[PDB]
């Protein structure tokens, strides 16, 4: 079984590499300056935002403030969906349940992968060509300056677990195969797959982070935090109704 769990982990990693062009490995290499590519353009204040305007404006497109990120994140939804197809047993679920699993799972996965683009100082944007600082996002007029700080707080702690793309591939799979999504038809085969993914995640973390005590449990608790952020977005939209407009759309288009 141990070789089976290792094979599953490797298959998921290989699928993840195929499905997601911007990986955590690539993001960290940009963030830490280890790449030979030009360092990303930086948006850190009003000057650099206006200077970078042409790089963040829409060329492909009250709560229009997030239509940019809604559109830009359609590609992640597709990549997540393609990744889900490689999860053993997933396409054998009833298609309604596949849809339901992805429709809830994608938001949690996008936040998971957004953390890969974040450090304590800011977040990669424009697929890694730009870097928007945490302080610039905080600098926005209330309530806009509060939108991303919960994300950064989650990301900093999430990133302190030091997961690599191999870890994240299984963790993301575990998220997708959540048997508690509202409206699931056939919970049992979903749980059966998730149990196998959890088994692979457990061994992966033991082998890949042997000195990281209770990492499996800590990772599982991060799923509660991910759901909390998605839930907090509902409250975010209410705060929005009870209210610069052009700047904000572009500023948020590569965030979530």
């Amino acid at each position: 079984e141990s070789a089976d769990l290792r094979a599953l982990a490797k298959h998921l990693y290989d699928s993840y590499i195929k499905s997601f062009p911007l990986t955590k490995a690539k993001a960290r290499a940009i963030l830490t300056g280890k790449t030979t590519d030009k360092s990303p353009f930086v948006i850190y204040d009003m000057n650099s935002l206006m200077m970078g305007e042409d790089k963040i404006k829409f060329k492909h497109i009250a709560i229009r403030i997030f239509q940019g990120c809604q559109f830009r994140s359609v590609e992640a939804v597709q990549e997540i969906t393609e990744y889900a197809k490689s999860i053993p047993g997933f396409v054998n679920l009833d298609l309604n349940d596949q849809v339901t699993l992805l429709k809830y799972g994608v938001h949690e996965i996008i936040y998971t992968m957004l953390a890969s683009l974040m450090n304590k100082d800011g977040v990669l944007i424009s697929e890694g060509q730009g870097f928007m600082t945490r302080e610039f996002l905080k600098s926005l007029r209330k309530p806009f300056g509060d939108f991303m700080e919960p994300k950064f707080e989650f990301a900093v702690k999430f990133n302190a677990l030091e997961l690599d793309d191999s870890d994240l591939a299984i963790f993301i799979a575990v998220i997708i195969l959540s048997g508690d999504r509202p409206g699931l038809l056939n919970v049992k085969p979903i749980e059966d797959i998730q149990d196998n993914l959890l088994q692979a995640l457990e061994l992966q973390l033991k082998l890949n982070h042997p000195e990281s005590s209770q990492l499996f449990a800590k990772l599982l608790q991060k799923m509660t935090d991910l759901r909390q952020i998605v839930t907090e977005h509902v409250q975010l939209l209410q705060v929005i109704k009870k209210t610069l407009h052009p700047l904000l759309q572009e500023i948020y288009k590569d965030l979530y």
Partner: peptide, 12 residues
């Protein structure tokens, strides 16, 4: 939802 239509399209 529009998201569900995109997911169904990606699944097919």
């Amino acid at each position: 939802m529009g998201l569900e239509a995109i997911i169904r399209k990606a699944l097919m």
